[PDB]
């Protein structure tokens, strides 16, 4: 019940580059390498949920100004057309999927807090016993560009060949990052949004609060967690009209000691990195 | 009569990644981009011609020593088995293709010679008029590891969008490399090999010379020059068992001001780099 | 039987200044609360993180009183 049983690296590559689609996660499966004796959408959206609009044309109205200026008795109501100039305020049909916030951790240590927050600072659920939320709802690992950060319990952490059982270092174990799902899904370390906490009045300011976790609301669309060559299990050809070439999984051509996904001098088959399948694209 | 007339970059990617196979090159072709108004083996061998042997098994004899040691009257004939220990002397059934040497040029200008050798140092053939040899026979552009060297006339050089007609800088043009074919073909800037130029004797030392040009011999094999998206014109699927994943052609992951193989703000379509056809591998 | 997945066991080596570290261990029979699971239930429901931690800020959590 792990893809690397049934697929070679070459076949897995062959699969993921050309196609748009096709149990406690214990050890004990058939080993990935045949000589060893032992004892679903696959694409990345090319559009983001909030940019679906036509940038060239106006829309509906939004409330631009609640006062005329600085002074007393300036209350007013003004309005403006939602348009290309301001895209944040336009009305939209669909909204991003559910969220349950994970505490954010940085791989470089000097950034992290000097305290033991492994268990205390983690997302858990209760059933009189408390259990960690892992991996949880499918959410983007980090905001765009910030690879050094990972959700504490929101990602599937594999391990390098020969890794120890306990207290291994960060370089020792692989941490998958769901960068592709950010388009439709909120970042696992960010709040979902804000709500109003009160009713404004002449004496009361508008007050808001953060949404840490948000269930399903009508209109939520989302993507699910990608599958990895090392990942548990339980063809649609690519139809795209895109002009410019795709991002495709590939092996870099540079001199190195060992061939990746091959035996070393001692005969130990090694998998260098996790490989998920989202490479080709689709319009949202 | 240029591939980019009939293929899009996305289509050209589908072709070269998935398939082992499928009039003076003047300007004036249909444009690469459809909205503009105008007025074969594709694989790289995974083995070299000289490594085809079985590394574990001895072969046949060669002459190891012509002397016993230092001194007078030390002549002897010793023979050894050509084997894994010494792989240069083993016998082979085939040899690399023909060569007609080009002068070598360095893209780092300070290590080129300070003299004018554009024309005077060029490979040519006369027909009482001397025409430059361009590109000439198919030969590897440069030795392994040297990417900064290119043969003088031995390559195809495309201009970047907007590149002027006359005396443009090195960056403004796109210099292709044949590096894939270094397996079966001699390097363009290197001599083909050596031949004995005399008969040795007690009074004559063995003399050799360099072969600067070579015609077809029985037993040669060679690859033709690869074709490019930008190049002149006038399917076969991969069956391979290769275990480790392939090299593929993928668009760069990083954010940029403008997308490759698309139009900019002024509406000018451009082709960033020359794209060859040879990515997948075969056995020699 | 162990899972092949890992979890974050320790964020500090000991008591004292600058002890930040990242350690990982195998989730297995010994500690069953940290194993990754495919399905979740649908007293408070659990806890979520309320803030980003940093060198200055400790990790904070809060109770989920209702959940969809």
């Amino acid at each position, epitope marked *: 019940n792990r893809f690397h049983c049934h697929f070679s690296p070459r076949d897995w590559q062959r699969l993921i580059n050309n196609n748009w689609g096709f149990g406690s996660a214990h050890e004990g499966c058939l080993p990935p390498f045949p000589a060893d004796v032992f004892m679903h959408s696959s694409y990345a959206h090319s559009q983001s949920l909030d940019r679906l609009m036509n940038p060239l044309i106006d829309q509906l109205y939004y409330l631009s100004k609640t006062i005329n200026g600085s002074g007393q008795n300036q209350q007013t109501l003004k309005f403006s057309v939602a348009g290309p100039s301001n895209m944040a305020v336009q009305g939209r049909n669909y909204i991003p999927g559910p969220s349950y916030r994970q505490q954010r951790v940085s*791989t*470089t*240590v*000097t950034q992290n807090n000097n305290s033991e927050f492994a268990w205390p600072g983690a997302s858990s659920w209760a059933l009189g016993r408390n259990s960690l939320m892992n991996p949880g709802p499918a959410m983007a*690992s*980090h905001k*765009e*560009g*910030e*690879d*050094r*950060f*990972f959700p504490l319990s929101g*990602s599937l952490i594999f391990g390098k060949q020969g890794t120890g059982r306990d207290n291994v*270092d*960060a*370089d020792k174990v*692989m*941490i*998958t*990052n769901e960068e592709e799902i950010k388009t439709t899904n909120p970042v696992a370390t960010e709040s979902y949004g804000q709500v109003a906490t009160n009713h404004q009045s002449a004496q009361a300011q508008a007050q808001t609060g953060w949404v840490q976790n948000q269930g399903i609301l009508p209109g939520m669309v989302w993507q699910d967690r990608d599958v990895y060559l090392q990942g548990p299990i339980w063809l649609q050809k690519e139809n795209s009209k895109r002009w410019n070439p795709e991002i495709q999984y590939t092996s*870099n051509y540079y001199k190195s000691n060992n061939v990746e996904f091959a035996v070393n001098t001692e005969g130990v088959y090694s998998e260098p*990195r*996790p*490989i*998920g399948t989202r490479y080709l694209t689709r319009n949202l | 009569n240029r591939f980019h007339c009939h293929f899009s970059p996305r289509d050209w990617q589908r072709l070269i990644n998935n398939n082992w196979g499928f009039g003076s090159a003047h300007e004036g072709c249909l444009p690469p981009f459809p909205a503009d108004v105008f007025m074969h083996s594709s694989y790289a061998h995974s083995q070299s011609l000289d490594r085809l042997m079985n590394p574990l098994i001895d072969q046949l004899y060669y002459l190891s020593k012509t002397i016993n040691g230092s001194g007078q009257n030390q002549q002897t004939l010793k023979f050894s088995v050509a084997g894994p220990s010494n792989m240069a002397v083993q016998g082979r059934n085939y040899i690399p293709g023909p060569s007609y040497r080009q002068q070598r040029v360095s893209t*780092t200008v300070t290590q080129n010679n300070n003299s004018e050798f554009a024309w005077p140092g060029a490979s040519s053939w006369a027909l009482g008029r001397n025409s430059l040899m361009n590109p000439g026979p198919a030969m590897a552009s440069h030795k392994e590891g040297e*990417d*900064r060297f290119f043969p003088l006339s031995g390559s195809l050089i495309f201009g970047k969008q907007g590149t002027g007609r006359d005396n443009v800088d090195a960056d403004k043009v796109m210099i292709t490399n044949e590096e894939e074919i270094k397996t079966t073909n001699p390097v363009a800037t290197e001599s083909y090999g050596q031949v004995a130029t005399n008969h040795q004797s007690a009074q004559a030392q063995a003399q050799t010379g360099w072969v600067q040009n070579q015609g077809i011999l029985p037993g040669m094999v060679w690859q033709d020059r690869d074709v490019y998206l930008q190049g002149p014109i006038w399917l076969q699927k991969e069956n391979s068992k290769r275990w480790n994943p392939e090299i593929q052609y993928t668009s*760069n*992951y*990083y954010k*940029s*001001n403008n997308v490759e193989f698309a139009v900019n703000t002024e509406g000018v379509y451009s082709e960033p780099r020359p794209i060859g056809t040879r990515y997948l591998t075969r056995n020699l | 039987i162990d899972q092949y997945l890992y979890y974050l066991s320790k964020t500090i*080596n000991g008591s004292g200044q*600058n002890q930040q570290t990242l350690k990982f261990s195998v989730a297995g029979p010994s500690n069953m609360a940290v194993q990754g699971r495919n399905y979740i239930p649908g007293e408070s429901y659990g806890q979520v993180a309320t803030n980003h931690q940093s060198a200055q800020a400790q990790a904070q959590t809060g109770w989920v009183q209702n959940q969809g």
Partner: antibody
Amino acid sequence: EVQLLESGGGLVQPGGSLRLSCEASGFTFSRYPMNWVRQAPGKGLEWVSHISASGGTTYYADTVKGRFSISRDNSKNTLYLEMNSLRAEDTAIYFCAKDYPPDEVTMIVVGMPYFDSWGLGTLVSVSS
Amino acid sequence: EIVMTQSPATLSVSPGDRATLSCRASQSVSSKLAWYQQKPGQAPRLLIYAASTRATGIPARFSGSGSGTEFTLTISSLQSEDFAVYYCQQYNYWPPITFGQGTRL
């Protein structure tokens, strides 16, 4: 070859500004992390800043923190360091260092900052 | 930060002789350390990284070992080409990456 070439001014007035540019060739610029190492005359090398291959995350020395800004351009294949409000203490020989190993796209990047290849260095000296 | 301390200031030895110099650091640097050399008017050159792992273009004579707070670099069969300043660096706790004062030779 992994040749690293950088160009910068040799003099400025204190409180002034300058822009260093390191241009790379011979390797995939996007794949590896980069950073600047500064060496004072007759002194050991001291690390200044760091920037990831993506360019999303950047780190700085406490001495320099907030005063200098590091920048990458993967397309133009160049590395930048924009320093301003310099002081006499800043006079030194700056180097361009290529981080070894490369950043990987699939895993959450973990960085070991040991530099495989360096630059020939430029000299910035600020005095009046 | 972590303060790297490289003990011998200048180690003057004869060629063809095994040289062992060291650098100690505060707290623990685990196994993440690297050795450099800087010849006069020349960029540094990476010698050893991790603990014992020797870089590709390095002669087979250079070797090193150590862990934790203490580390040893062993040069065997010194030659005229090997005379220069040396440096150690730990990438364990950063920023800010720290470089040792150096050992002339």
